[PDB]
Design an enzyme around this catalytic site. Structure first.
Site, PDB file in Angstrom:
ATOM      1  N   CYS A  31       0.800  -1.198   0.000  1.00 24.18           N
ATOM      2  CA  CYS A  31       0.000   0.000   0.000  1.00 24.18           C
ATOM      3  C   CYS A  31       0.854   1.279   0.000  1.00 24.18           C
ATOM      4  O   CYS A  31       0.289   2.390  -0.074  1.00 24.18           O
ATOM      5  CB  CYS A  31      -0.881   0.007   1.246  1.00 24.18           C
ATOM      6  N   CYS A  56       2.072   6.960   0.899  1.00 27.20           N
ATOM      7  CA  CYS A  56       0.847   7.196   0.110  1.00 27.20           C
ATOM      8  C   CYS A  56      -0.260   7.683   1.043  1.00 27.20           C
ATOM      9  O   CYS A  56      -0.342   7.197   2.166  1.00 27.20           O
ATOM     10  CB  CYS A  56       0.397   5.868  -0.479  1.00 27.20           C
ATOM     11  N   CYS A 100      -5.086  -2.781   1.975  1.00 25.52           N
ATOM     12  CA  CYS A 100      -4.926  -1.343   2.032  1.00 25.52           C
ATOM     13  C   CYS A 100      -6.173  -0.707   2.626  1.00 25.52           C
ATOM     14  O   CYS A 100      -6.086   0.224   3.425  1.00 25.52           O
ATOM     15  CB  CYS A 100      -4.612  -0.742   0.659  1.00 25.52           C
TER      16      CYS A 100
END
Ligand code: FES
Lengths: 118, 112
Positions: A31, A56, A100
């Site tokens: 992720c 992220c 994720c």
């Protein structure tokens, strides 16, 4: 999405608690991200909560929503908040790996468990 | 220097392109304003990772001021020196920018 965009643009509860009652950190290189949830516990309830992401930022909208939902709840109630009920509260979420998708709820559960250890 | 170039949103853009990373779920959106058949303004918005952002910053800077024809030819290969040995997980992240740029140009071309 207007609502999901609201949570990405103006996330609730971003930050750190300096002396936390419970701390959970989860991440997954698939992720591209790590995230942390901090809780303060008063009575038997989540009195304060903060999250932050590293890497992220795709889990921000879910994290913002989960933390808002957990605030003020008993530990037992908060432990029952799942990705699936956060998903409903955002009215779904764009295509992603399930691992994720679960990061925020997994960090919340870790933070609660951490508190319980004490 | 450290702030990526061309970050933001354009209201009522001449062209709009969006592509997604199906793994982490992040979206890459590119907005273009076109004057004189050139990219007069260009902005990107993402909540993705550093590889998504660094690539997008480079591709949007390269596209700025170019003819639509030239911009359509911009590939990830044009910035490959800045992306050497990028880990396999991040390849999809680095491809978002050029894909969204091409979508935005095609979007504009579909309205005339
Ligand atoms: S855009 Fe999410 S890991 Fe790269």
């Amino acid at each position: 999405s207007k609502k999901v965009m609201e949570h990405f643009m103006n996330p609730r509860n971003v930050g750190v608690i300096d002396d936390p009652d419970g701390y959970g950190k989860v991440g997954n290189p698939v992720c591209g991200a790590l995230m942390e949830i901090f809780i303060k516990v008063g009575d038997e309830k989540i009195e304060d909560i903060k999250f932050r992401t590293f890497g992220c930022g795709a889990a921000i909208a879910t994290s913002s929503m989960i933390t808002e939902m957990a605030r003020g709840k008993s530990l037992e109630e908060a432990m029952r908040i799942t990705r699936n009920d956060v998903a409903d509260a955002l009215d779904g979420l764009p295509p992603q790996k399930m691992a994720c998708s679960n990061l925020a709820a997994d960090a919340l559960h870790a933070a609660i468990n951490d508190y319980l250890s004490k």
